[PDB]
Every structure is written in C-alpha cells, then in structure tokens.
Design a protein around this ligand. Structure first.
Ligand code: EMC
Ligand code: EMC
Ligand SMILES: [Ca+2]
Length: 302
C-alpha cells in the first residue's frame, strides 16, 4: 500500500486561502503539521516595514483557513520550522533573526503563539558570498542524527548534523556545503522530508525562474548522502507555474509539504502529497518586503 514519488509532478491548486489580518500585508514562509486532527500553521508576517510571525487558530479543513483566527507572536520567529520532538516529548519552533543566526524555542502547547520558552542558539556560523547570511533553516532527524539544512540566497545549500541525543541544542558554527549552483538555481526556502514507505529523502529548494519562483526537487537514500536532481528545471519542476494548476499566482514560493505526522522525521506520504505554499498576484509590484504573499495548497494528482 506504499507509493513512490513521480518523475513528473502534476498538481491541482486552491485559490487564495486567507487574507492577512489588519496591519499585515503578507503571510509567508509557512510551516505546518497536523495536531489533534487539525491543521496547525505558523508563518512569517510582514507589515511592509517589519517582519513578525504568527500562528493560525487550528482548523480542520483548508477551506476554513479564511476564517481561522490569526494570532501574532509577541517575539518574531521569522521563517519558522515547527515540529514535535518525540525523544523529549517537546515541541520545537526554529527560526532566523535574533540573538543568533538560527534560534529555537520549545513548548508543550504549539497552539499558543506566546507559550514558547526563552530563545536558545541553534546555529552560530557564517557563510561567504551571501548578502543575507544563513537563511531558511529546516530541521530533520533520522533514527540516529539530527540535521540542519539551510540556504544563503547565493546558490548554495548547507548542512550540519549532531547525534540526536544532543538535541535540542546548538549545532555551533560548523557546516558542510552540500550543493553549489547559480544563485537563481538554488536560492532559498530549502525543505527536506522522509518519503514514507521508501528508503528515500526528498529535498526541495526554491529557485528564481523566468516566469516566477518555483521549486526544484532532489532525492537521497540517506540524510548525509549525495543529492540527485529529480524534478529540477523550470519546465519540469517539483512545483511551479508549469504544473501547479494555480490560476492566481505565477509564483510557487516558500512553504511546507503537509506533514500529518508532526514529528522530527519530517515524514510525508507520497500517496497523499500536498504543498502549503506562498503565492502572489502577478500584478503586484513594489519593494520585495511589501509584496502581498498569500497561502495556497497544492494537491498531487495521481
Ligand atoms: C497532543 C499531542 Hg497526540
Ligand atoms: C481539506 C481537508 Hg485538511
Ligand atoms: Ca521553511
């Protein structure tokens, strides 16, 4: 009863799923798990002038995201990663921009935007040839090791690791440069997942295409292994204008595959693949930080 990842992806898409509440011009950079039978979604916010973060009130159906309460975090967790860390029975929210390059907080109740612990260092390193520094972290563990993957708006993807018994904790300053390409080809928004029922991991990376933002996919048999391009061009992307089925956006940008199991393995079911992404009206212009990003969901057509 197991499925494999397709070689060519075809999606159908929702329309815009929610509008930002008063004071925000964008909802961005989503991370999502199922918690108590409901969708739990964190994201970045932008007022145009500054970035923050928020969590939606839990909702059962994506069609009800539009009415879900939008709960601001009193301390910004930009480009967040949410998961349940089973070995310690604790939830983890990792993010960027704060006292360290990457940061995390912990909680026993991930629905509360302000129930998170004092911030702790996740990563303290620096990268060369990057205007942004380390950005868009994700975290993923197998049975043995916890991995940190991140980008740099510079064509590189980076990786750090620790024995899983040492997490939650600080990866420190060290990293491995695992991928190197043009800036456009490996830009940001890196995510990594375990493919359920297969000895395979899936990496997606946001790229800058001629037509807009899209995702390129890569596979590996191990988290410390080499990554093989899968659906890795604008014409044959993991998800993009070419195959999204979205009518409201030419961009498929920073989000998260829908994770039914909320745990640190980041496991996805290839039989039921869905992608919570950010998109925007093709007519929207102005400064990047003011762009009206919105949530959408892609569902894989099999
Ligand atoms: C409330 C965690 Hg099964
Ligand atoms: C739209 C079913 Hg989570
Ligand atoms: Ca992310």
């Amino acid at each position: 009863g197991t499925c494999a990842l397709p070689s060519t992806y075809r999606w159908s898409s929702t329309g815009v799923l929610a509008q930002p509440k008063s004071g925000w011009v964008a909802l961005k950079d989503f991370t999502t798990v199922t918690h108590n039978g409901r969708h739990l979604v964190y994201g970045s916010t932008s007022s145009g002038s500054s970035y923050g973060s928020m969590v939606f009130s839990p909702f059962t159906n994506w069609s009800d995201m539009a009415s879900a309460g939008q709960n601001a975090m009193n301390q910004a967790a930009v480009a967040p990663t949410l998961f349940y860390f089973a070995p310690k029975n604790i939830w983890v929210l990792a993010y960027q921009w704060g006292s360290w390059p990457f940061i995390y907080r912990t909680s026993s109740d991930p629905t509360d935007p302000n129930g998170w612990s004092a911030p702790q260092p996740l990563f303290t390193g620096s990268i060369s040839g990057s205007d942004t520094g380390p950005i868009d972290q994700t975290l993923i563990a197998d049975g043995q090791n916890m991995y940190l993957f991140f980008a740099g708006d510079n064509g590189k993807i980076y990786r750090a690791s620790m024995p899983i018994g040492n997490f939650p904790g600080n990866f420190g300053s060290s990293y491995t440069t695992i991928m190197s390409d043009t800036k456009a080809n490996l830009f940001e928004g890196v995510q990594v997942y375990k493919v359920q029922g297969q000895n395979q991991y899936l990496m997606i990376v946001e790229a800058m295409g001629a037509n807009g933002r899209y995702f390129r996919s890569f596979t590996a048999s191990s988290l410390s292994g080499s990554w093989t391009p899968q659906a890795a061009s604008e014409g044959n992307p993991f998800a993009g204008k070419a195959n999204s089925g979205a009518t409201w956006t030419n961009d498929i940008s920073h989000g998260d595959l829908v994770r039914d199991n909320p745990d640190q393995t980041m496991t996805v079911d290839p039989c039921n693949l869905q992608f919570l992404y950010q998109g925007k009206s093709p007519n929207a212009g102005g400064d990047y930080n003011s762009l009206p990003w919105r949530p959408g969901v892609l569902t894989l057509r099999r």
